[PDB]
Design a protein around this ligand. Sequence first.
Ligand SMILES: NC(=O)C1=CN([C@@H]2O[C@H](COP(=O)(O)OP(=O)(O)OC[C@H]3O[C@@H](n4cnc5c(N)ncnc54)[C@H](OP(=O)(O)O)[C@@H]3O)[C@@H](O)[C@H]2O)C=CC1
Ligand code: SF4
Ligand code: SF4
Ligand code: FES
Ligand SMILES: [Zn+2]
Lengths: 90, 99, 71, 330, 185, 116, 687
Amino acid sequence: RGQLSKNIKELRFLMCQSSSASASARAFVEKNYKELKTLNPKLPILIRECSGVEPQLWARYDLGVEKAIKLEGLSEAQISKALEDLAKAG
Amino acid sequence: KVLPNSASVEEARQRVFDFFRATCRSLPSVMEIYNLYDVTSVAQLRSTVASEIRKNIGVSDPKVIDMLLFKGMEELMNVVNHSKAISPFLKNFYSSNYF
Amino acid sequence: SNHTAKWMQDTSKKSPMELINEVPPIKVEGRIVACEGDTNPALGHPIEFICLDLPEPAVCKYCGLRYVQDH
Amino acid sequence: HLVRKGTGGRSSVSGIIATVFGATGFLGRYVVQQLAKMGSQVLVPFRGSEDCPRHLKLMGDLGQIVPMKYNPRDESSVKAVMAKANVVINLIGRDYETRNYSFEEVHYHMAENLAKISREHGGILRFIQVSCLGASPSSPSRMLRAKAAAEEVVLRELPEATILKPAVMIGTEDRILNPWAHFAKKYGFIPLFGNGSTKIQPVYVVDVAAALTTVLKDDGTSMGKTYELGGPEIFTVHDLAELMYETIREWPRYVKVPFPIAKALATPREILLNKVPFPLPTPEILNLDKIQALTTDTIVSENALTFNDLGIIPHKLKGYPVEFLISYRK
Amino acid sequence: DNQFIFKYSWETLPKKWVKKMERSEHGNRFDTKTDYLFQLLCFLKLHTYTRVQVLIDICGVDYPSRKRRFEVVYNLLSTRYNSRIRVQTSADEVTRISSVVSLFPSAGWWEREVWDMFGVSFINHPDLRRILTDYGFEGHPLRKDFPLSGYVEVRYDDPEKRVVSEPIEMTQEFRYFDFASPWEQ
Amino acid sequence: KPGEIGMVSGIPQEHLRRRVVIYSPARTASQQGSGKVGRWKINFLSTQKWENPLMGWTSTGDPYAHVGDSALTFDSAEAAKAFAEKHGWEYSVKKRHTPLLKVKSYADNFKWKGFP
Amino acid sequence: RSPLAGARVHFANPDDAIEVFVDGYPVKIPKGMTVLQACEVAGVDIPRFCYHSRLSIAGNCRMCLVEVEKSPKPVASCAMPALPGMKIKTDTPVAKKAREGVMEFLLMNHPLDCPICDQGGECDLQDQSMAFGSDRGRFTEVKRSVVDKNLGPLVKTVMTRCIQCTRCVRFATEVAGVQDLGMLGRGSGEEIGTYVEKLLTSELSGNVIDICPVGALTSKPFAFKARNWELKGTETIDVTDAVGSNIRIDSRGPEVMRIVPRLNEDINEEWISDKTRFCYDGLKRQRLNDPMIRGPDGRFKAVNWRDALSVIADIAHQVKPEEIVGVAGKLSDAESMIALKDFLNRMGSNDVWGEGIGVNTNADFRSGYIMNTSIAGLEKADVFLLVGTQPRVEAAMVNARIRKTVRSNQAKVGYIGPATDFNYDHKHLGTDPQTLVEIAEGRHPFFKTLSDAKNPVIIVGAGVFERKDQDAIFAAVETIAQKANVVRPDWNGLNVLLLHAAQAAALDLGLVPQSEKSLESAKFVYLMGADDVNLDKIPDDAFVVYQGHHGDKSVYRANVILPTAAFSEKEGTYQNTEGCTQQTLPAVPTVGDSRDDWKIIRALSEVAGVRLPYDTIGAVRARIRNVAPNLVNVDEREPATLPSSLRPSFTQKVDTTPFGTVIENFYMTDAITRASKIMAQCSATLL
Ligand SMILES: NC(=O)C1=CN([C@@H]2O[C@H](COP(=O)(O)OP(=O)(O)OC[C@H]3O[C@@H](n4cnc5c(N)ncnc54)[C@H](OP(=O)(O)O)[C@@H]3O)[C@@H](O)[C@H]2O)C=CC1
Ligand code: SF4
Ligand code: SF4
Ligand code: FES
Ligand SMILES: [Zn+2]
């Protein structure tokens, strides 16, 4: 959890301002962004919101390797577990 | 002679067949018109005409089919009357900016 | 200078700029003038009225002739 | 570095100013046409009549084809012609002699003068000089020996110079197929020389022009190279004659005169030319230099760079190159 | 002037095909459907009191905004009653409209010209080859989207010993001057 | 189908696949007339103009250099989109910007400042 | 009956809609909207010379006269308010005669110098005379003449042509904010300008020539270069500032001839800054047009793109990927920036950053680093707190909108930063982040004003990004917002005023540096047109490749030079401080054999080991959608609903160093602007 910067070089969340599918992602990004940015400062945890894009999470590891996972039908716990899996799969 | 627009896909197909017949019968005249006997390969020319007809299958409008056949017959008449590894991106890049 | 050399390459005859600088300013009694181009108004340029309150000569902006007030 | 400022074709820039010495000849037409199609500017220096480069005027855009009158014996005139040049192409050379110009003067001395002027004028980026395929110091033909000496002195004086060595070139304005056809039409037969068993590699003239254009466009890979240019397949003289007769649809007829009597027949022209002060008719067929060149085979050596190394395949000589002979039928 | 046979036509002509009519001093105008144009012209040519027996011309107008961009116009004249009439229809690129060569034999060349310039094909033309442009012309020059200078240009190719056609590379490009005044409307 | 008209119109195939911009030319900033607004143009992005070596003129090689600005004028963006889809070339419609009218008054021009 | 120019009416409330008759056809209009705008809604335009929509109302020209029923005299449309049930007529003989007479009186003293006048075909006097005025002239006596005025190196003045409409007198008063121009005199002969020799100097001074109907005020650099009909106009955006003001580039052939503003109510109403208007001159000077390599002797030799890319790839492969740095320039489109980031990442380096971005910048919140209030919100604002920013020198259009808001409603604007001169009676609170912390703690009268004033706006300058205590600064500003209710569900008053065109898109793509020693601990430097990167920091034994269009500062240090296309020659996506993303358009052909930025990046990548997966700008924009989907909605503003209060603060106190002047010239800030001769003249004269 505190070792995202160990493998992940850049984290990205993409959602919508008011989409129903992205509703579950907003609380997660709020709380978890606060606590992780408290934990590891150097990791960019970029947050982007568009008009109709599907909620998804991107992880960029060294040599510019990007892995994306859709968060459209996952709760907060599922999204946290998926983020941990992305960190561990680096 | 020009005919009214085909009202059926079967009629359009029959007109396409008639045009292909006309092209095939008019092929040997093009031989003496152009005189490229070394590498013509009349069979290859017939194959290329068939390939053009087969790449023009995405069209489904009978009006568009009839117009295409009319223009093809016009082109046939004109030809009878003797009227003539670095990837693709990098080659265009080395050539010019507008590609 | 640069403009004259840009449109002309003879550099042996006198350019129009030098001729128009060589023609002396025209002294006029009144405060305003009527600049027409030549003795025949119909064969010159559209009439241009020039104000002469400034001490320096005023270019006509047509057939520039540098009219100057008398006093 | 040349800079291109257009899409291509006519009315472009291409950043090349090519001075083509000997552009009024058989190959000059095609090389100037290719250069003007590229969009480059072509300076055509012509020797005599004002109408010699007339046709060359129509193949380029306005002001792109510039004709210059000069004296080939005048170094100052040559310098003035080459004043605005960016690249230089040399095609000067005659198949025969004249009381004024000999083989040595027309090839070796002129190539030396061109090389010296190009070396003096530091603005020249490319110097493409054309010689013959059989140009060797040991070649029996005086013209071939002179061309070989000229290419050697061009390499010595200007190392940054490419040398093309095309074989006999056939085309609408060639000097072998046309005389053969004229002789066949006039007399019903053509004279074979030494029963026509010798072999050559005739090459298509537009193919040679495209080869020269590719050499000009090379990215620095042929600064000091010699490119031997030949056709796809080796043709014997008899085979070429048979192809000519088939193209004209006439019955072939040969006499096959031996080399000694052919040389005896062609001998008096040289002594008469050196003696009398008036010019003699140019030898279209009975040329002693052509006989001497025909004494030995003129084919590619398989060692020097060829069309395959340059990047363009030669054209087969049956239908595309010999289409001009139809006008000779009936 | 001479709006006599125009009014008489509108009084006697069947009302089925008269899509719209215009009474103007610039020329009386009939606009109909392409299906009934041949019948309408046959009625006018043959009727004893509307004898427009001479076809002045056939023209085409391109309107890229409309669904049926092409407008085919027929200017006809009645020498017996001394008046001009205009009958027009709307056609698109693909649909073929009826030909009036049988009624007016002069219509053949104007219909070929319309084909050449726009692409409106005719149903019963004895022949419909191009008439005005170059042999093997590819586009339809009078369409609005067709560039003014065309797509190809010709020149003499010395190696080919013939006049070849190459894509346009013209110098001194056409300079379009926008003179339109914003207060003209 | 979106492109049959273009493929049968006789336009060369190399010019039937090119990105164009559909936009309504805005009012000129030099003058306030509004009679040249509301029209829609197809902007063939043809910028391949150079200088003629002989006379310095502006040469070109693209047939669509000026036709979109000179001859092709459309009544509406829908008509322009229909034309582009018919002729087959890719298009991207640019949103037109429209002035917003607000209430103005010469009485508000002469307003009263507050007490010192 | 569509409204004139497709205009959209703004109803303050649907209840207030009076029914007014214009030419017989009735229309619904708000209460206070005048007769001229009533007829504009109806769809008919009336000739006007002294009326501008943005400026105030004056009856100087008396030409917009229409006949309203139950009125003996023609009324001025631009000034008479519209009353319910009022019958307005514009095509009556009374109105036509009034227009003809007013045109005759206007033209009785106008000089016969249209052919030399630069407003040929774009002169309102000519068009309105040909539309509404008569075709003859009854005047043959002596005209009047006025001596010309010297108003700077931008405005050429021919005062004989002035029709005294006072449109520019009240423009300098209201919009520009500097009162120098004035109508002085009385009677038929009254002059306009300054009594003393005073060159007019303002960021918006270029708009004075734009609103002049006659050719009285004209652009001096464009004095007699070309006419109107010759020039083809492409609708593009500007990159000199971060406002992204919409412009129209008028060009005649391969060169840009002039730049004019165009209407965009969301960004710039009708105005334009001097730098934006006159930056076209730099596009033809010091222009790189050939790939070049610096030889052993130190001089540049021109080579091919193939050779340049080969040597760059070889040097990039030679060095270890840790000491490889990429720098995006002041102006750069999202396509080029994402291509650079992808190429450097695939080379094994994570040291790509944009110009004007600090080492520790929390770029994880668009609401954090953009103008959330937007320009319309700035219009709606009531109190401004400008910390670390000087809008007069960066974002001149934002400064103009702040001035317009101050004029519209009295706004208590407070400014914190270095000493500067404003034009909307600001209050200089202080010069210190310590004063900012005081305001945050709440022991400040301006904090009291912010607390008790509705609709507050806090604008933080983007120069805080270069600071090391920006996290503490933003924490203090967030405290101010929390204790003053600046961030509400319906209103967001937090704003960050970026000063570079590529800054917003760089932050969206995540171009932030990772270490302080990044530039001076690297062996391979890739300057994406970065001419302000402090070249002395880079070690001498470092291979520098400068991908740019103008050779100003980084060319003298670069080992390889790559020429590209400027903003007027390429289609590229930019984003403004407001958050709106918009695309420029190719106006003029590229100079030399210079390709696009992303094109040469992709070609260099392919030459190197790692090939970028995209070959067309469509796929490039697809990748941009993948990384940050806010850059693929052209001309659409995407609000950020996530609050910036979630950002943690790592520095517990602010530095004592006062706010510095990030922009010192406003006339030499970018590569093109610095290369602009006329802008250099403006910097020399008007400073
Ligand atoms: N026989 C062939 O076709 C082959 C020739 N070659 C080589 O290619 C060269 C060029 O051949 P090609 O163009 O076909 O033949 P040309 O003889 O037709 O071309 C030579 C050109 O230079 C001109 N010229 C001739 N003599 C002189 C002179 N003394 N001074 C100045 N100009 C002169 C000619 O006539 P004008 O003065 O009227 O301009 C002509 O324009 C040959 O010299 C030879 O070395 C190689 C293979 C085959
Ligand atoms: S503004 Fe006046 S001087 Fe200039 S062209 Fe128009 S009417 Fe003439
Ligand atoms: S200078 Fe121009 S804008 Fe100013 S008052 Fe005169 S006419 Fe009006
Ligand atoms: S615009 Fe109304 S009086 Fe001038
Ligand atoms: Zn005068």
